[PDB]
Design a protein around this ligand. Structure first.
Ligand SMILES: CC(C)[C@H]1CCCN1c1ncnc2[nH]ccc12
Ligand SMILES: [Cl-]
Length: 167
């Protein structure tokens, strides 16, 4: 039993809710919140810009030190950093950005990072300003993640389409 509330159960391990991931994280304080990161951990917009804003830029400060030490992530890769005031940890995961011409097959690799964590709060990878088809992202999530994932979808109209079209 966990404190996530109001989720629709899509499968044995995948749950979904129309919710602002920022507000969800502040309420639940999950062990792991997933960020929709880029390889430079430059949290300027989309989910990443919103999460970073909620940390008063502490996420960005920590991220800049991480990049200065380690260099950029790989597309499809991840790193674990602090969750600041939002969660114990933040798993920064880089899905392919279609508006950069990145290979959509890497979306499965991106979701594989979730399997290293028993329970996560997360957005749909490569959705929003990353330009992938969210119905596809949900399909890959369900077919790749085996741990317990609670998906927050910001857009109510998109949420209704994902549920109604879910096979
Ligand atoms: C609409 C969703 C599929 C993705 C794509 C863009 C933004 N988005 C978000 N999802 C969850 N929580 C969020 N908080 C702020 C933005 C945001
Ligand atoms: Cl985004």
């Amino acid at each position: 039993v966990n404190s996530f509330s109001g989720y629709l159960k899509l499968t044995d391990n995948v749950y979904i809710k129309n919710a602002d991931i920022v507000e969800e994280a502040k309420k639940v304080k999950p062990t792991v919140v997933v960020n929709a990161a880029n390889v430079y951990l430059k949290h300027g917009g989309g989910v990443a810009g919103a999460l970073n804003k909620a940390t008063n830029n502490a996420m960005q400060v920590e991220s800049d030190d991480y990049i200065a030490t380690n260099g950029p992530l790989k597309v499809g890769g991840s790193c674990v950093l602090s969750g600041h005031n939002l969660a114990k940890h933040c798993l920064h995961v880089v899905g392919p950005n279609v508006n950069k011409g990145e290979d959509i097959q890497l979306l499965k690799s991106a979701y594989e990072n979730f399997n290293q964590h028993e329970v996560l709060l997360a957005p749909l990878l490569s959705a929003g300003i990353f330009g992938a088809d969210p119905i596809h992202s949900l399909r890959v999530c369900v077919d790749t993640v085996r741990t317990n994932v609670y998906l927050a979808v910001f857009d109510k109209n998109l949420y209704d389409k994902l549920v109604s079209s879910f096979l």
